[PDB]
Design a protein around this ligand. Structure first.
Ligand SMILES: CCCCCCCCCCCCCCCCCC(=O)OC[C@H](COP(=O)([O-])OCC(O)COP(=O)([O-])OC[C@@H](COC(=O)CCCCCCCCCCCCCCCCC)OC(=O)CCCCCCCCCCCCCCCCC)OC(=O)CCCCCCCCCCCCCCCCC
Ligand SMILES: CCCCCCCCCCCCCCCCCC(=O)OC[C@H](COP(=O)([O-])OCC(O)COP(=O)([O-])OC[C@@H](COC(=O)CCCCCCCCCCCCCCCCC)OC(=O)CCCCCCCCCCCCCCCCC)OC(=O)CCCCCCCCCCCCCCCCC
Ligand SMILES: COC1=C(OC)C(=O)C(C/C=C(\C)CC/C=C(\C)CC/C=C(\C)CC/C=C(\C)CC/C=C(\C)CC/C=C(\C)CC/C=C(\C)CC/C=C(\C)CC/C=C(\C)CCC=C(C)C)=C(C)C1=O
Ligand SMILES: CCCCCCCCCCCCCCCCCC(=O)OC[C@H](COP(=O)([O-])OCC[N+](C)(C)C)OC(=O)CCCCCCCCCCCCCCCCC
Ligand SMILES: CCCCCCCCCCCCCCCCCC(=O)OC[C@H](COP(=O)(O)OCCN)OC(=O)CCCCCCCCCCCCCCCCC
Ligand SMILES: CCCCCCCCCCCCCCCCCC(=O)OC[C@H](COP(=O)(O)OCCN)OC(=O)CCCCCCCCCCCCCCCCC
Ligand code: HEM
Ligand code: HEM
Ligand code: HEM
Lengths: 417, 32, 55, 445, 98, 52, 31, 270, 55
């Protein structure tokens, strides 16, 4: 009836909450992502994410697929730049079965040569599907043009590695990035004893911490792209802060102060300062929003903009000017309070869904290692003062920039201007 | 637009049973 | 795994010749005689054999 | 705590009814958030040709302004507490819901009352709103999935109001007026067809007392006497083909007349539908998925996005599939997909029926996760069924259906029934309607 | 004893004279296609040669000299580990079919 | 044609297609007696028998 | 999809880092 | 598979054609062999009797039988041609099988320069033997009694079918039961259809199967023994030799070859 | 311009039949009896005709 953390001697923090829900979700979160990829194994993480049904040590691909389908389960491998989350959710009197299916695919894989070779083609399909939305390309180019190494690595395999990701790279990546110390097993709707039983039964296979990655450095590039789509997706960011600090909370509050996104369908973002500031000016279809991306060792605060090709030069300008206003103390406490309310609501509403709560617990366990109640998170959010937001804005303004743009970039202003 | 298009009226060709817009064709499907 | 109509090597030619053969939509009755010849030939083969039975 | 015990817990959906007709219905479990919205029963079904598209326009102008909240001030409030106000308008139901913290429940219901009762409908916003819809119509024109389902409804329920699109033809939206919208609001936004709903940290007593002192002004009478009645629709098995070779893929949708909301045959048929399942080229299951059609498609790379559907209106529905494949796959897929249906109508096996039951159970349970889906379920169920079906009852119905029941219901709905195919794009291998109807029966049987 | 009989049979079989290893004489059924496709590149590349050379001897209807014959002790079972895996997968599929 | 075809699903499929196959055999038998004009059946029949 | 008005653009501007996800019986998604 | 089934059909129809053609010249042997062979069909229960007059066209092999046999013998070889075309059609989809049995897709050579001349040589070499047959000793393969006007009043002292049918006649006269004889006649040829199923050796080629090779040559000797026995009249010791040869032939095709293949595979780690 | 051997319908069929058909090199003499059969059949088709005109 409550959350229960447990750090076994080999790390591997175990969390479980018996919510008595008709369905239970077991998710294993691993501190292994693109940032831990090196210059020679680029795309390995993407292949691993695409390899969630390959023949494991104790369960052939046919058995895994057929069993999970027969009990009616989903095996998601939700991945970030710094974490990969396996997840299976099914009815209460089934999880045991798929529990094994989750573990064999995460700690005892085989990576058979034929299966990997056949799966290599799926990398192109996934990249093409995921790159239809322009934001994917822009965000990947942003990380490439902002971080020198580590975080710069894309979540998707570069086209020059499609078909050349040998299974040996997969085995090395698993052995050096799936050790017990860097993983967290979370279970919603399952009792803690059985979770501990399966953990110490099999997940103890790979002890240790593993090959640590390298801290990402901030270059400040301007990776651009003239792809020809009418809308110009531009994004201008700067090194904000690492998550888990007062600076991170202040930047998160600043995001809602400027603008977080739509709240009323068929609205106008009247409260959002960025949208209204740009609205005076560009009288054309457009959208703007503050962008906060907090990572384990660094972070990025900036502005994302989608506007008409010709008008883009105004938007990226006008929106930026708005942030400049917040820099030299042009912010009222009422806006701070509204942003705090929006942020608290957004946090308490991400955890609404059971899967969202599972992701929250997984992130807390992987990064911090000690879950904290939403109430204390609200206290931390409230603890931010106006001067801290004003700073944060100063740090963003007087900091090395990083721009990424895609579209007809004829009138897109350059990072120097 | 997709909304603008519509099926032209076929009332000249329909069988007697399926001719009104309120009845259901399931009743007379077996007959036809 | 695949329709026998378009999988069997012998069925390939029959399907492509009489089942899924793209034919003009506005073909008049004057083209029906193309079949009428062939069918008629079979009768001439069918009858003509039986005449050869007792001859 | 096994599955059954968790199903029993299932916090209840206490339902009440104030005098004017509006029925409140809440579901409180623990959560500090809430999703409070009304579910006015209206849509393209209750719309004649002259005013087809009024409902979409009304939903567009709902949040723009009110008599109480002048203009964008309503948006200012909604964003002040961080609420995410939203609205969706199907062919039968149109709903407004606010996703907000439970503490701000008193304000949210007041906001809902203002939007759904005291709407300005101001002329200038109508003119500005006109451009948005027209552009939205082009966006939906590019929505290569949506136009196919619109074609399905147009070519299946011809003549009937169901064929009418939700947005409306791009000629009524250019000739509408405050008069036409005001009649729509007066004739449809009435208390009997309104389900105030909430889920989360919402005490049912709270919702009731708030409804009495905010929504009691809603009337139940209908102008002079005019009451928009129910016009039963007819399923005219037909075919529509919009051949456009420029489009890369070829969306095709085929459906037969499936049951209505009240018909229990939904429970077996869904299981049968779950047998065929769904697939996308990025699934990862590949040639190992238990669904035969999915395994074939992944093995031969036939489709990209085939998926079954069970669109079900009040008295009739559409039951079938929608597949997206290249130009030289349709002729094959119409062979396999139909070839699957007949198999279910002739040789359904309890081994796969158990799998279908499990998939249906997981779909029902997972869909009811989070406050907003719960509120959607409450608002939709009080209208379609008249009561929120508890998950225990769903479990009982799923337990009843077996191989014989699935075979019987598929034979009663699928076998020998004229389809309602609808193509788009480079559809040329798409077998002629004679061929499609030919596949609807198996000569072995 | 058995091994003597298997010696005699291997000598009298014939594929030793043609340079063919034991796993080269498999009748290719539906599973053996997948077995061959599953082979690593080096084994595939040696197998295609061995087969082509043997077909060359047979078209000339000659045999290799005694020295270049595949001995019983030098007959690697390269295909068998993949063949048994393919058979096991097929049997698993058949069991699931019931 | 071995243990593969023997299983609970195959037995159930047999049961499912037994009525159809059996009355297909009935179709074949009726067609055969009709085509051959088999007296040894047709004599026992009603009105048909009056042909002879 | 066509996006050519002020409204439909709203929500397209991402404000959080990209997160990709694929499954076994669910399609690939990004955020 | 399909090529093999089509080949079995070709064998059936070509043997029927040859029987009818041999009936055509209307010698004593022709008429009497026709009577015996058609009368064999009486063994079938119930409707076996009625087929005999239907095929006969009357109450005995007479005018109608000869005329209709001429007509069928004329038409059938074109059916043989059609089935042979389908045979080649089916063969092409997989390609020919080399003596080694293993797939030779890495060694295929074009047909026109190499095998056209090889089959030219083969056809000319066959014509050599055919011309020795026709030109030097034409009636070497055929009963001299055929050169006698057929008379339905005097059975010839020696009765046999042609040299290419005596082998089946041996099994016919082996089984005392008439219906058993006809069933054995059908089965002697139809047993080729069971051969693809009975193959249990992991090798598809008989080059590397010594024991099976000895079995195959024993089968060939069995067929030649059946032919010779069919030539001889049914007396001691030909009767028991015929029974033994029939049993041995069926036993080899059905049992010895599969058991030999199984012990074969056991002998080679598979 | 296209080679008539591999473009004309009848020539294409004949070409795939017995001109450029990929056949194994180690085909022994025993496969010749395939073609010989047809050859005899052709001769059997021929001579019988010349018998049939005086029978
Ligand atoms: C009154 C006198 C007879 C009608 C007038 C005929 C006349 O002067 O001009 C024919 C008049 C003008 O020709 P048309 O309509 O342009 O011909 C269209 C097709 O080419 C030909 O017609 P279609 O192919 O569109 O339709 C078939 C048509 C015509 O069918 C045929 O012509 C073929 C079958 C009939 C035997 C062939 C010799 C005639 O069949 C019939 O009209 C009656 C049934 C005939 C037997 C079954 C077929 O057409 C008709 O009257 C009907 C078709 C011709 C009938 C003869
Ligand atoms: C020493 C004299 C006794 C006979 C020698 C041949 C023998 O019996 O076995 C060796 C051998 C048969 O055993 P093999 O070499 O394991 O198989 C060869 C294949 O049959 C592949 O045969 P091929 O394509 O190299 O052409 C030869 C084939 C030609 O066969 C035919 O033309 C059909 C059968 C004869 C009519 O005849 C034979 O293979 C058996 C010998 C037939 C004549 C006795 O045949 C020859 O070397 C042909 C010798 C021709 C006369 C010189
Ligand atoms: C619109 O075009 C067409 C038609 O009708 C207008 C047709 O009926 C047909 C089909 C025609 C036939 C099946 C009959 C004519 C064909 C032949 C005589 C070719 C030989 C093949 C046969 C099956 C018939 C002879 C069989 C035996 C002796 C074709 C091809 C056609 O093209
Ligand atoms: C075998 C199925 C029955 C065939 C048959 O003889 O039907 C009776 C009918 C009519 O004859 P019937 O009705 O006198 O029955 C057969 C009687 N005997 C056995 C004496 C001939 O048969 C025919 O018309 C042809 C028989 C051969 C059919 C093949
Ligand atoms: C001037 C003839 C031309 C071709 C027709 C179409 C192909 C065909 O004959 O199919 C027969 C079919 C084969 O099985 P089927 O499953 O349809 O194959 C596709 C993959 N499932 O056969 C079947 O599906 C079942 C076999 C027939 C059963 C018939 C039972 C009733 C008795 C007659
Ligand atoms: C036996 C098998 C069937 C017959 C052979 C089929 C394949 C060959 C027939 C076609 C052919 O040889 O055509 C030659 C000639 C066409 O012109 P040419 O430049 O020689 O060839 C260009 C296209 N291949 O076409 C000619 O007619 C060239 C002149 C021939 C002599 C007069
Ligand atoms: C191309 C198709 C054919 C045509 C146009 C054709 C035409 C004719 C004609 C006009 C006659 C004269 C009939 C009479 O005067 O009474 C005839 C007779 C005959 N035909 Fe054919 N015939 C054809 C096919 C065949 C075939 C395939 C056979 C053999 C199987 C055959 C066997 C005979 C025989 C035996 C006679 C003589 C008996 C008689 O006079 O009817 N015919 N044919
Ligand atoms: C009407 C007489 C026949 C003709 C004209 C004929 C024609 C041919 C030809 C030309 C070939 C290719 C050459 C070869 O491989 O031998 C062939 C192959 C073949 N025929 Fe026949 N055939 C006849 C009878 C038969 C019979 C009776 C059978 C057995 C039932 C048969 C089974 C085969 C097989 C199995 C092959 C493939 C041989 C291989 O792959 O090595 N055929 N046929
Ligand atoms: C499938 C190939 C054929 C075979 C194996 C075959 C076999 C035979 C045989 C064994 C005889 C008996 C010869 C004798 O006793 O003197 C014969 C006679 C005859 N065949 Fe054929 N035949 C074939 C094709 C044909 C064809 C296509 C025709 C018609 C064009 C034909 C017409 C005749 C005639 C008229 C006779 C009687 C003349 C005679 O017996 O000397 N045959 N055939």
């Amino acid at each position: 009836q409550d959350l229960e953390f447990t750090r076994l001697p080999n790390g591997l923090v175990i969390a479980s909450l018996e919510n008595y829900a008709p369905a239970s979700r077991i998710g294993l979160f691993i501190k292994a992502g693109s940032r831990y990829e090196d210059s020679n194994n680029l795309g390995t993480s993407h292949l691993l994410r695409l390899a969630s049904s390959l023949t494991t040590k104790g369960a052939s691909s046919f058995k895994i697929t057929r069993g999970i389908e027969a009990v009616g389960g989903k095996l998601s491998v939700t991945s970030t730049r710094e974490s990969m989350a396996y997840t299976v959710e099914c009815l209460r009197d089934d999880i045991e079965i798929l529990m094994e299916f989750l573990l064999n695919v995460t700690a005892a894989p085989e990576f058979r040569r034929w299966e990997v070779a056949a799966l290599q083609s799926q990398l192109r399909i996934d990249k093409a599907v995921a790159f239809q939305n322009p934001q994917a390309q822009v965000l990947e180019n942003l990380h490439a043009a902002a971080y020198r190494n580590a975080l710069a690595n894309s979540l998707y395999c570069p086209d020059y590695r499609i078909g050349k990701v040998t299974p040996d790279q997969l085995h090395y990546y698993v052995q050096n990035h799936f050790t017990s110390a860097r993983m967290a097993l979370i279970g919603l709707g399952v009792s803690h004893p059985v979770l501990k039983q399966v953990a110490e039964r099999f997940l103890n296979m790979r002890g240790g911490l593993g090959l640590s990655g390298a801290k990402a450095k901030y270059r400040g590039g301007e990776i651009r792209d003239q792809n020809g789509d009418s809308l110009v997706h531009a994004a201008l960011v700067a090194e904000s802060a690492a998550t888990g600090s007062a600076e991170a909370n202040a930047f998160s509050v600043l995001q809602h102060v400027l603008g977080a996104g739509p709240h009323v369908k068929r609205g106008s973002n009247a409260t959002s300062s960025l949208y209204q500031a740009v609205a005076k000016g560009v009288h054309q279809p457009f959208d703007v929003s503050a962008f906060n991306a907090s990572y384990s060792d660094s972070g990025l605060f900036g502005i994302y903009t989608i506007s008409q090709a010709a008008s883009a030069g105004d938007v990226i300008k006008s929106a930026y000017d708005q942030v400049k206003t917040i820099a030299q103390g042009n912010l009222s406490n009422t806006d701070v309070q509204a942003a705090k309310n929006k942020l608290k609501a957004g946090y308490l509403m991400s955890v609404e869904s059971s899967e969202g709560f599972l992701d929250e617990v997984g992130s807390q366990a992987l990064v911090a290692g000690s879950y904290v109640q939403p109430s204390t998170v609200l206290q931390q959010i409230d603890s931010v003062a106006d001067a801290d937001v004003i700073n944060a804005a100063k740090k963003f303004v007087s900091g090395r920039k990083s721009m990424a743009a895609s579209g007809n970039l004829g009138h897109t202003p350059f990072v120097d201007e | 637009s997709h909304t603008d298009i519509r099926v032209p009226d076929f009332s000249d060709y329909r069988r007697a049973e399926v001719l009104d817009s309120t009845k259901s064709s399931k009743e007379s499907s077996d007959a036809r | 795994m695949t329709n026998i109509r378009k999988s069997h090597p012998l069925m390939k030619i029959i399907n492509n010749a009489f089942i899924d053969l793209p034919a003009p939509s506005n073909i008049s009755s004057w083209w029906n005689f193309g079949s009428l010849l062939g069918i008629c030939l079979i009768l001439q083969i069918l009858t003509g054999l039986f005449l050869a039975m007792h001859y | 705590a096994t599955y059954a015990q968790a199903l029993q817990s299932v916090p209840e959906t206490q339902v009440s009814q104030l005098d004017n007709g509006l029925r409140v219905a809440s579901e409180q479990s623990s959560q500090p958030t809430c999703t409070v919205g009304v579910w006015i029963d209206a849509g393209s079904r209750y719309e004649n040709e002259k005013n087809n598209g009024a409902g979409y326009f009304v939903e567009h102008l709902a949040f723009k302004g009110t008599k109480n909240r002048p203009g964008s001030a309503l948006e200012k409030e909604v964003e002040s507490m961080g609420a995410h106000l939203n609205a969706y308008s199907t062919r039968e139901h149109t709903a407004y819901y606010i996703k907000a913290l439970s503490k701000d429940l008193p304000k949210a219901v007041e906001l809902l009352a203002d939007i759904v009762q005291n709407c300005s409908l101001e002329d200038s916003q109508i003119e500005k709103e006109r451009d948005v819809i027209l552009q939205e119509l082009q966006e939906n024109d590019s929505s290569m999935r949506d136009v196919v389902f619109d074609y399905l409804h147009a070519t299946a329920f011809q003549g009937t109001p169901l064929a009418q699109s939700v947005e409306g033809p791009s000629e009524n939206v250019r000739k509408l007026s405050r008069a036409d919208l005001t009649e729509y609001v007066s004739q449809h936004y009435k208390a009997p067809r309104m389900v105030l709903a909430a889920a989360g940290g919402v005490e049912h007593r709270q919702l009731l007392d708030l409804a009495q002192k905010h929504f009691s002004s809603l009337s139940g009478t209908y102008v002079e006497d005019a009451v928009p009645a129910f016009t039963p629709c007819r399923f005219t098995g037909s075919e529509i083909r919009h051949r456009d070779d420029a489009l890369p893929l070829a969306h095709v949708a085929i459906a037969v007349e499936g049951p209505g909301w009240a018909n229990p045959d939904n429970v077996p048929l869904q299981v049968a539908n779950a047998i065929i399942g769904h697939y996308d080229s990025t699934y990862g299951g590949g040639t190992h998925m238990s669904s035969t059609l999915a395994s074939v498609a992944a093995t031969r790379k036939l489709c990209q996005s085939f998926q079954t559907f069970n669109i079900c209106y009040a008295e009739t529905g559409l039951l079938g599939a929608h597949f997206v494949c290249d130009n030289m796959s349709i002729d094959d897929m119409m062979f396999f997909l139909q070839g699957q249906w007949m198999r279910l109508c002739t040789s359904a096996t309890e081994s796969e029926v158990v799998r279908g039951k499990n998939i249906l159970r997981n779909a029902l349970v997972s869909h009811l996760d989070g406050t907003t889906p719960v509120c959607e379920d409450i608002g939709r169920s009080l209208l379609t069924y008249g009561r929120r079906i508890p998950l225990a009852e769903w479990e009982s119905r799923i337990a009843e259906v077996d191989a014989s029941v699935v075979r019987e219901v598929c034979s009663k709905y699928f076998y020998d029934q004229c389809p309602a195919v609808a193509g788009l794009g480079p559809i040329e291998q798409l077998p002629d309607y004679n061929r499609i109807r030919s596949g609807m029966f198996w000569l072995r049987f | 004893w058995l091994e003597g009989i298997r010696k005699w049979y291997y000598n009298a079989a014939g594929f030793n004279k043609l340079g063919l290893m034991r796993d080269d004489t498999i009748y290719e059924d539906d599973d053996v296609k997948e077995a061959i496709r599953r082979l690593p590149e080096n084994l595939y590349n040696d197998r295609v040669f061995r087969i082509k050379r043997a077909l060359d001897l047979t078209m000339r209807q000659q045999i290799l000299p005694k020295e270049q014959w595949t001995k019983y002790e030098e007959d690697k079972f390269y295909l068998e580990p993949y063949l048994k895996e393919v058979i096991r997968e097929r049997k698993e599929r058949e069991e699931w079919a019931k | 044609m071995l243990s593969r075809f023997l299983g609970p699903r195959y037995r159930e499929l047999a049961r499912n297609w037994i009525p159809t196959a059996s009355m297909w055999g009935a179709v074949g038998a009726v067609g055969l007696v009709w085509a051959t004009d088999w007296r040894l059946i047709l004599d026992w029949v009603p009105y048909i028998n009056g042909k002879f | 999809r066509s996006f050519l008005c002020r409204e439909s653009l709203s929500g397209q501007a991402a404000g959080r880092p990209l997160v990709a996800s694929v499954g076994l019986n669910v399609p690939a998604s990004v955020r | 598979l399909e090529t093999w089934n089509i080949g079995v059909v070709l064998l059936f129809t070509v043997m029927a054609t040859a029987f009818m053609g041999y009936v055509l010249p209307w010698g004593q042997m022709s008429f009497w062999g026709a009577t015996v062979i058609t009368n064999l069909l009486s063994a079938i229960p119930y409707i076996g009797t009625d087929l005999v007059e239907w095929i006969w066209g009357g109450f005995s092999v007479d005018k109608a039988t000869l005329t209709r046999f001429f007509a069928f013998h004329f038409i059938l070889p074109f059916i043989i041609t059609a089935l042979a075309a389908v045979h080649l059609l089916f063969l092409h989809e997989t390609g020919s099988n080399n003596p080694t049995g293993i797939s030779s897709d890495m060694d295929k050579i074009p047909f026109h320069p190499y095998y056209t001349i090889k089959d030219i040589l083969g056809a000319l070499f066959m014509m050599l033997i055919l011309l020795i047959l026709v030109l030097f000793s034409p009636d070497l393969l055929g009963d001299p009694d055929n050169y006698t006007p057929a008379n339905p009043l005097n059975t010839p002292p020696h009765i046999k079918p042609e040299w290419y049918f005596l082998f089946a006649y041996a099994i016919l006269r082996s089984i005392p039961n008439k219906l058993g004889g006809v069933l054995a006649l059908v089965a002697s040829i139809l047993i080729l259809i069971l051969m693809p199923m009975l193959h249990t050796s992991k090798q598809r080629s008989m080059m590397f199967r010594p024991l099976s090779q000895c079995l195959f040559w024993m089968l060939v000797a069995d067929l030649i023994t059946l032919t010779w026995i069919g030539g001889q009249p049914v007396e001691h010791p030909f009767i028991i030799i015929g029974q033994l040869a029939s049993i041995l032939y069926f036993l080899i095709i059905l049992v010895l070859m599969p058991i030999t293949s199984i012990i074969e595979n056991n002998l080679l780690k598979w």
